[PDB]
Amino acid sequence: TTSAGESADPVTATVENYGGETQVQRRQHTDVSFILDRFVKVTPKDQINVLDLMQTPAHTLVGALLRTATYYFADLEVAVKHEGNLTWVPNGAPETALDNTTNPTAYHKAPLTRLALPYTAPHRVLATAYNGLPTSFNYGAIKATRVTELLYRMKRAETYCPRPLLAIHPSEARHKQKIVAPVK
Amino acid sequence: TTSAGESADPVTATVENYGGETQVQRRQHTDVSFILDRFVKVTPKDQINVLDLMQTPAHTLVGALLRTATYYFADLEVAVKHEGNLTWVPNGAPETALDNTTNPTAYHKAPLTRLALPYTAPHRVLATAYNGLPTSFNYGAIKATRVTELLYRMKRAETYCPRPLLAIHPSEARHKQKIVAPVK
Amino acid sequence: SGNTGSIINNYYMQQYQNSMDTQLGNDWFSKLASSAFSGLFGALLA
Amino acid sequence: SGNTGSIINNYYMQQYQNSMDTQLGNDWFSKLASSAFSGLFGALLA
Amino acid sequence: GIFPVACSDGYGGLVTTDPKTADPAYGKVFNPPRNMLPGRFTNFLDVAEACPTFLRFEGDVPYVTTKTDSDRILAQFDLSLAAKHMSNTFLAGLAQYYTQYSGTINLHFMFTGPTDAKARYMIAYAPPGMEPPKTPEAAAHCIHAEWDTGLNSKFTFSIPYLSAADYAYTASDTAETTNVQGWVCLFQITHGKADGDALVVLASAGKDFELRLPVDARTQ
Amino acid sequence: GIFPVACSDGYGGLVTTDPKTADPAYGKVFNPPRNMLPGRFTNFLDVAEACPTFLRFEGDVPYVTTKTDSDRILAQFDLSLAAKHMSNTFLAGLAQYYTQYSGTINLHFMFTGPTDAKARYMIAYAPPGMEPPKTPEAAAHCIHAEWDTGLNSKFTFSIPYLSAADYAYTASDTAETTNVQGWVCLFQITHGKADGDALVVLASAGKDFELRLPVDARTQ
Amino acid sequence: RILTTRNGHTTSTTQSSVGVTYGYATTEDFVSGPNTSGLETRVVQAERFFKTHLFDWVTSDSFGRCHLLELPTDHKGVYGSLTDSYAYMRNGWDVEVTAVGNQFNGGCLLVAMVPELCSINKRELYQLTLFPHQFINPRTNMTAHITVPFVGVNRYDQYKVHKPWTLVVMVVAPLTVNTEGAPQIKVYANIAPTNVHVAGEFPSKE
């Protein structure tokens, strides 16, 4: 299939150009809302954990596929292992508001605490890259006596204006791994 | 009932050939999906357990009735006693993917963890004998800090092209066992 | 179908409980066992 | 919509489970991918 | 408030044969297409009925040879599925994983001698209660069937289910039963120049054969 | 009394990919309006199909230059998505988070030489099973496509999915596969005064390209 | 019991035909799958008989001596050229095994098509009847005819690394040379692939 390659219109070619037939596709694993709706762990601080999604590592699945977008919308789901009582404050709250139990405070029950947090930012969408370290937009903050594990989960995820993904660069021709297989 | 015995057509004879009558049968215990839908224990490794159904012993019920087929289809059900957090990766995943919690990770709750795993192989059916130790086809892998007990359960089992079953060969005319009975 | 005996429908959808089958375009030994010659071959006297 | 597979409706209302959307007054790359030129440009012989 | 429940003691333990299913963790997986694959079997008794398998005799052979002497007993064994003659069949390989059976057991007697070798055989069923016969004239008072060789080489005899109970055990533990469920008695009546030829015999499940109460003992 | 339930063992543990939702704590929050924002994408394969990205060659360049000597091999690589030529594409950046794929991979060959520079190129698919060709006369017996430069500068070739299984792995662990899923072979046939000009090449997903079983290994 | 079977332009007529055993299916499964994207071709020139000496059956051969023939075999015809030209193939097999003696021999052979016969024991030879099979009994016949389709975990197979079918021939009763019988029986195979399909043509060596 010849075309004007500089016009940047999307041009796809099929196998039917040389006598094949294009088959059916199931793309339910590469859609945005499905693939981002899973927990990813971040390294927590000792007490105060500002909840923004740039604490996710960039080499993880949710981190890299999150940083694929320029803009995003999500509600948040957090699962915290903590000592004492976990306290959440929304976006724009002072840090002394983290010392009050009238703010949403989940008392300790073993082994962890799983709670749903809404979108509390004053912006219509958030950003992965801000021209202007982006602006102080986040999902509030939590604190306990100590926080040992902190998980995020993006739900109702929407993404806008895609940005590059980079795979690992091999030293030889192919990047080889040890794919799991039985010994015998 | 006389026939051509070399033609290998199926020929059954009844008691009605000598004045009897054939009775009704209930065969709900020898069908494939019922008899294979039960847990069988395998010997686990210390951390990494590649989930394939040839870890089942050949003298068990599910192992021998599994190895009766050439081809099979099943979803999988696993019940694991483990220390730490149990992590599952699908078929084709690297082993370093077993070190990440974004993959399906069941946190520890006493006494065990029972979870359902789908069919994740790129083949239409799996194999008990491969002409070519068969090829690396399996149901993924799990790991924890240590795994103490590992159970399988085949659900929606389908079997194709049957192969031999062998009973134990007695030394005298009949294989005698101690069938459970009261002393008095 | 197998060793399941609950009468209440499942809480999870079929998309999350099992793998979904795909059509293209029991079961042989049932027909091979049902096609078994059962009578007699010769001429039955008495 | 996402990674949810329950068939029983939620115990909580929509006002308490999620943030509620507001109207004023997928989705571009679906139309950009569907508008891809798929055929041939020249005159196909044989 | 909220809905009160009573968490009952004795309920909720993991039983390895429960009708419950596990919770999912990994959703919307579509399988490759699998329709119209050859060799589909849904029940093990379908392939046990449709496919007979050989018996075993002394010398580890699937056949029995015609003796030419005064004593005319050809083979004799039990209706245990755990018998030594039945031990290499598929029917015993199923029956080792079940405690009870019922119904008819088919035996297939096909003759592999030359065209100038003739024979006449007799199969008999000795019910339990007295010792089994040694002579065909003594076994003529049983349930028997007599046939001779010809153009059709295979003869199928259906050993019937005669018992007090409607289900019979598939083994003894170790201790003692005598020879319960009786005997299968293979006799030859006459032979003409059949010296040393083979009669091979298969065994399969009958039409009303059923096999219930699954169990795992050992020996896959 | 009250309703009895059996709290089952093995159920209720926190799985990181469960279809369940958390309990709310902070209700009736209304979002700012968000309708008709530009750049909405709902599936990563939509932007993988609609937007091709460059390949990589030796010297870290998205192009390949026309050689003028006896050997006329221009580029050659594998149908691993983990290949070194595919390593800077968006399609491999998606494919590192999935274990299996299927379908067609489009390659876009557009020519950036002057108007007095002509060339004729050949793209070929070597299936796995024997070693890939070194000559265009040897690759003429493959699935190939030949084109020449003119008014239309870009030529799109659709590398087909030929495999035994209907899904193919996106990597090897480390140990050993030879070069499974075959080779992509770029050859030049003729050139006229095209000495040292560039042929740049993009890669994108086909129309029936699909990518399943999400995984997280490393390297964001 | 006269039967004439024909593949391509090759004909085989027998007069001791007890029947044809269709194993595991009578028809072929679905050929055009999603794994080759419609790039298939049926080769009508490759579905014809080829011959192979199998073994020689004598009196010293007791119960259970097998002969295994993994299909496909070394083939110098068109079907052999299909394996060196294409990456993926698909076929069933039409197997016709002859054991010519006379009707004054005894003994009995069991021929069977086994899928993926990678290892075999002694005792499970007792259940070789579980596979598509016929008996060769010199008292009655000297011809066994078994037709069988393609099986596998994949719908197309690459035959240079995997051979799915195995023709096994087993002595179930030893041969006798009663005074007018033949002293030994040379056993022959007559095999023809059915419904072959190729995909993914190779580069040449020229």
Residue numbers in the entry:
A (entry chain A), B (entry chain A): 1 to 132, 159 to 210
C (entry chain D), D (entry chain D): 15 to 39, 65 to 85
E (entry chain C), F (entry chain C): 1 to 220
G (entry chain B): 13 to 218
What do the authors say?
FMDV, a small non-enveloped RNA virus (genus Aphthovirus, family Picornaviridae), exists as seven antigenically distinct serotypes and many variants and sub-types. Structures of several serotypes determined at near atomic resolution have revealed a capsid composed of 60 copies each of four structural proteins (VP1 to VP4). A prominent feature of this otherwise rather smooth capsid is an exposed flexible loop (∼30 residues) on VP1, termed the GH loop. This loop and the RGD motif embedded within it (residues 145–147 in the O serotype) comprise a major site of neutralization by the host humoral immune response and mediate FMDV binding integrin89101112.
Initially for both viruses 2 mM Mg2+ was included in the incubation mixture. For all experiments, the micrographs clearly showed bound integrin and no evidence of capsid dissociation. Conventional single particle analysis assuming icosahedral symmetry, yielded density maps for the complexes with the virus capsids at 3.1 Å resolution for PanAsia (13,438 particles) and 3.5 Å for O1M (1,649 particles). In both cases the integrin density was visible but very blurred. Comparison of the PanAsia virus capsid with a high-resolution X-ray structure determined here of native PanAsia confirmed that the integrin had not significantly altered the virus structure, except for the GH loop of VP1, which contains the RGD. In most O serotype viruses, including PanAsia, a disulphide bond bridges residues 134 of VP1 and 130 of VP2, causing the loop to become disordered.
